[PDB]
Subunit: 315 residues, 4 copies
C-alpha cells in the first residue's frame, strides 16, 4: 500500500520538482475532502455548497501556501491576508452536482491550480485567475460516491487515490488512468433535446443507430454530476456533453472552475476536451464566471461531435 | 435519534403484529448491508455480486427465521437445512447495478419477503416463491451511495434509515416517504431508442416538448442502478422506465426479484408500478426468472406512459 | 465470523430458552455501548457518567422489554411507564472508572439482569432490585479500551465480543473465557495500605515474598477501572482487591451494581468472588446502595486472602 | 478545530524554523500511528511489536527525510539506503507496553528525533544515535487508549492531538500541557518491593503515610504501560518510577528509546526526569541498549525520591 503523500514524495519529477509545495496543496484539498465527506456521509442524519466552500477556503488558507482563491460560489476572488507571499492560486467548484446531495447520489469537488503571474508580496488579481487552461500546473477532483476518491494530475498522467475509512488515509489505487481504446457510452441531459445545437442532435441520433461494427447503439448514462459522469467515462470509456441550450446560450459549465481542470485531466488520460470547435485549454478567458459548451471524453467520440457540428452548423 | 430496531418495536401494528419476527428479518438484511458496504466502500483498495449473494444468504440462514431464499444470482431456490420450521421466504437481488461497482457509482440491494404457502416442517418449493407481488408482507432496498441507507415497507408507508458510521447503527431519517405531487424527471436508457415500443418513443418525445404549464421539457437522469434511480425519483418525483427492447423482448428486469418489491414500495409511497398495461403486483408469475417491462414512479407519469402505449400499440 | 446476535440465536439452551428476550436485552446494551463509545473515543475533541446513564436508560426503555432499572447514579429505582408488563429488571453501573475518562485510560459499563419478583402489570419495587446475586439471570460488562468489547454470561460460560468499527457490529472473539490455572498478578490500590485490614496487609506481603516455586513475588497491576482490571486478570490470571478502608468502612464497591455481576462472571469463568469471608452471590441485600469488600479472581488467590483474614482478624 | 499539520505550519518558530521537515517527520509518525491503531483496535477480531516496528520503519523511510533509525526491537541501527542525504535520525520504542495488547489495555509508541552528527552523503553511525538526551530536537509518543492521541515537543511546550475517526485526522486538543502544581499519585510495580533500592522503599512508605496536609497517603495507579502511566500523571499530576531490581540491575527502561524522550517531554511540561541522582537528559550514552533507573513526573515528587535515595543509600 502507498499513500498519497508517499506518492507525492516518490514522483519528484512532477510539479516542476517543487515537491514540498505540492504536498501542502493536496494536503489542504484532502483535508477539505475529509471534512466534506463527513457531512455528506451523514446527510440524512444551497447548504452543503456553502459548507464545502468555507471548509476548502479555510484549509487552503491554513497551509499558507496559496495567495488567493476563486470559487464558483463567490462573486469576487478571495485574497488571503497574510499570504501575499504565496505564489499559487486556486480556482474551485466546491461542490459539483448540487442536485444530487439530497438524493444520496454522487457529487464531487473540482480544483484547478495556477502559478500566479502578478509579483509576490503584492495581492493577487483577477489577472492571476483569468489565465488559459493550458497554464494550470495542477488539476483534479474529489468524488464522493460509494467510496471517496481523489484524482489529480500535474502534467504526467492521471493519478487516483481511494480514502480508506479503516485508516483515515488516501491510498493509491491507480497510478496511470487512461481512457480505454474506444467508448460506448454518451452522457448528456436528453431532456434538453429540442434546444440542442443541430449538430449535437445529429450526433445523438448517430449514437442511437444500429451498427454493431462500431458498438452502436451506445449506452446512455447520466448521473447529473459532472465529476461522477467524467470518472465513469474515463474508466469505462465514453463522452460527456453539455452544449448550449435555451437556458444556457454559452453552455452551463464554467470555463475556469469546471471545464479547464476536467480538460487538463481528460487530456492527460489520452482523451480530448472541446467546446465543439476549439480546444478548451487554449481559450482565453474573458470573465471570471464565463460559461462554455463542453464535450469531453474519448478522442474519437469528441471528434465525431466536432464533425457533426461542422456538417450541421447553426442549431 | 431513533434506531431501526427501536422503530420496529414502536410500530407494533405493522407486519401483522409479529414484531419479533420483523426484527430478526431486517437484522439479517442490515448485517448483510453492513458487510457489503464494507467491501464496496473499499473497492479501489461478476465478483461483488457473488460476495453480496453469499453474505446475504448466510445472514438470513443465521437468524433461523427464513425457510429458504430465491436469488437473482441462483438458478434454483435455496432451501435452508434445519429451517424447515421457518414460515417466511425471501427473494432478493443481492447487488443491483452491476455496471456501477468499478466506477464508484451507486448500487443497491433489493429484497422481497413472502409468507410461505407450503406446510411448515416440510421444505419450501417454487410454489412459495411464485406468488404474486400483492402477497408480499415486506419489501425494501439498500442503497450504497454517498451514504448507505435502508428503505422498506410492510404495507403502512415507506420508511428510510441512514447508516451512521460514527455509531455503527441505522437511524430513522424519514418515516413516511411519499412521491411529491408531480414529477419532472424521466429515467430510461435512451441509447436503446430505436428498439423501444412505439408508445414509449412517443412518451419520450412528450417529455421533451416545451410546455412550461406542465414543467416540460422534463429533466433526464439515469444512473444505471435501479435502486439509485428509484430512490431519487421517490424523493424528487420522476418515473423510471425499462421497456422491452431488442435484447430483452420481455423487458430486462426480473418480475420477482426487482419489479414486485419496488412496485410494493412505489405504491406504498403514493406512486404507481406498471408493465405498460397491467399492475405489476397482480401479475401471476410463471417462472422464477420471468422478466417484465417496468414503469414505476409518480402516478400521473406512469399513466401518461400507459396512455401512449394505448394510442400507439405495437412498437 | 459470528455476530453477537447470531450467537444469541445459536445458544438457545441459555437464558431459560427465552432467546427472543435475550436479544432485545443485549441489543439495548450494545446500542448504549456504541453511543457511549462514540463520545469516549472523541473525549479530547461527573459528565460522561450522566451521559452514559441517560443513554443506557433510554435504550433499555426503547426495547419495551425491561420493567425498570436501578442505577449507581440514581437515588431511587426507575420505573418505566408503559412497561408495567415487562418481566425483567436491570441494575447497572453506567460508567465504571470515573477517574479514567479524562486520561484516556480504560473505563467500562457493568450491568446485572434479574427476573422480577413482583406481579406483572403492576409497577416494580425495590423488592425486585434487592434480590441476592445468585438470582441474576444475566450479567456482563462493556470495556472501552484500545478496542471496545462486550462480555456477558447467563449461566453457561463467559462470552466475549469485540466491536468491529469497519462493520459497526460486535463479533465473537472468545466463546468460553476461563481464568488460567494460576494467577500471578494482584490488583489493589496500595496507597490505602495503612488502613487495610491486617489480613490483607499480610496477603500483600505474601504477594511480595520471593518464592519462585509459587511464582512469587507477583506482578502489580492497577488500572483504576474495575472492568479493565477484571478483564485482564480473567485473561491472564490474577486477583482484584478492594477491602474496607478509612474512607470506606464497608468497602467502596456497590454490592448490587458492581460486586454481584462481576461475581457471577468470575464464577462462570472458574474463578471466585468473596467479601473476605462469604460468597458475594449469597449475600442478602439490605439497601439499594449497600457497599461491600470485594475479592475476585483466581480461586487459589481469593482463598489465600480468605485464609490470611482468618489467621489475622481485626485490621 | 485545528489539525496537527495546520498547527505545525502555525508554529514556525519551533524546530529551528525548518517547518517543512517537521511536517514530513510527524507525517510519518501519524501514518504509522494510524496503521498500528487499526490493527490494535481489532486485536480480538511478540507479534504486534514486530508489526508496529516494520510499519514505523517503512513510513519513516518513505518520507525520504530520515537517514536511519534505531529501534528497541533491533540489535543494530538501520541505515536507509538512498537516504544518505537525510540529516535526521530517529530512535523509537515501536510498541511500549507489550504485556497490554492481549488484555485490551492501553499501549503506546515512543519516538525520539536527533539531528545527525556525521556528514551528510555518508551513512549514519551509532555515533549519531549515542547522543545525550539534551540534544534531541523532537520527542513524543502515541497512546492507543479509549481514543488514540499523539503528543510531542520540539522544545517549546508539550502539544497533544486526538485522532478523530469521523474525519481520519488528528486534531489539537491541548496546546500547552503542564503538570499540575502538585501530584498525588505514584506509579510503580510494587510487586518488586523487596528488591527495590532502600531509598525507594522509604519513599513508598512516605507515600502511604497519613498527612492530609500534603495529600498523603497518595493514590496508587499502575497501568503497566509507560506511555499510559506518563500521560495520566502529566494531566493529573503524579510520578512514575522504575528503579533497579533483581531482574534489572540498571533499571528496565532503555535510556535512549524510552527515558530520554519521555524526559524531554516531562521537562517541557514543567516536570522532572531523573535516574535517582542525575538528570536523565545529561547522561552520556555508552551503548545502544543501555538501561537506566527512571523517576519522572511532578518535580517535588521526583525530588522527594532523590532525597530518600540520598538519606538511605545502598538498597
Ligand atoms: O441539471 P442539468 O442541466 O443536467 O446540469 C447538470 C450539470 O450541472 C452540474 O451539476 C453543475 O455544473 C454538473 O455537475 C452537471 O453535469
Ligand atoms: O445497462 P442498462 O440496459 O441500462 O440496464 C440498467 C438496469 O439493469 C440493472 O443494472 C439490473 O437490473 C438495473 O439496476 C438498471 O436499472
Ligand atoms: O480510586 P480508588 O480508591 O482506587 O477506586 C478505584 C475503583 O473505583 C471505581 O472507579 C468505582 O467503583 C472502580 O472502577 C475502581 O476499581
Ligand atoms: O512488567 P513491569 O516489570 O512492571 O514493567 C512494565 C514496564 O515495561 C514496559 O512495558 C516496557 O518498557 C513499560 O511500558 C512499562 O512501564
Amino acid at each position: 500500500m502507498k499513500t498519497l503523500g508517499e506518492f507525492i514524495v516518490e514522483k519528484q519529477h512532477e510539479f516542476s520538482h517543487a515537491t514540498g509545495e505540492l504536498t501542502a496543496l493536496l494536503s489542504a484539498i484532502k483535508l477539505g475532502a475529509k471534512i466534506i465527506h463527513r457531512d455528506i456521509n451523514k446527510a440524512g442524519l444551497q447548504k452543503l455548497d456553502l459548507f464545502a466552500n468555507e471548509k476548502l477556503k479555510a484549509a487552503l488558507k491554513a497551509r499558507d501556501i496559496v495567495a488567493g482563491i476563486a470559487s464558483e460560489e463567490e462573486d469576487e476572488i478571495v485574497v488571503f491576508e497574510g499570504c501575499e507571499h504565496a505564489k499559487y492560486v486556486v480556482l474551485m467548484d466546491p461542490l459539483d452536482g448540487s442536485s444530487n446531495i439530497d438524493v444520496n447520489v454522487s457529487v464531487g469537488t473540482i480544483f484547478s491550480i495556477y502559478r500566479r503571474v502578478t509579483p509576490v508580496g503584492t495581492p493577487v488579481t483577477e489577472e492571476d485567475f483569468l489565465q488559459p487552461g493550458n497554464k494550470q500546473v495542477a488539476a483534479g477532483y474529489v468524488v464522493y460516491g460509494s467510496s471517496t476518491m481523489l484524482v489529480y494530475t500535474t502534467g504526467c498522467g492521471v493519478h487516483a487515490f481511494t480514502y480508506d475509512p479503516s485508516l483515515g488515509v488516501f491510498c493509491l489505487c491507480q497510478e496511470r488512468m487512461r481512457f480505454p481504446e474506444k467508448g460506448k457510452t454518451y452522457s448528456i441531459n436528453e431532456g434538453n433535446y429540442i434546444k440542442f445545437p443541430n449538430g449535437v442532435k445529429k450526433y445523438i441520433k448517430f449514437c442511437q443507430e444500429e451498427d454493431k461494427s462500431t458498438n452502436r447503439p451506445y449506452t446512455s448514462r447520466y448521473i447529473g454530476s459532472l465529476v461522477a459522469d467524467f470518472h465513469r467515462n474515463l474508466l469505462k470509456g465514453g463522452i460527456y456533453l453539455y452544449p448550449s441550450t435555451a437556458s444556457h446560450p454559452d453552455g452551463k459549465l464554467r470555463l475556469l472552475y469546471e471545464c479547464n481542470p476536467m480538460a487538463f485531466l481528460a487530456e492527460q488520460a489520452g482523451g480530448k476536451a472541446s467546446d465543439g470547435k476549439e480546444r478548451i485549454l487554449d481559450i482565453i478567458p474573458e470573465t471570471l464566471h464565463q460559461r462554455r459548451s463542453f464535450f469531453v471524453g474519448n478522442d474519437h467520440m469528441v471528434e465525431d461531435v466536432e464533425r457533426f457540428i461542422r456538417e450541421f452548423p447553426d442549431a
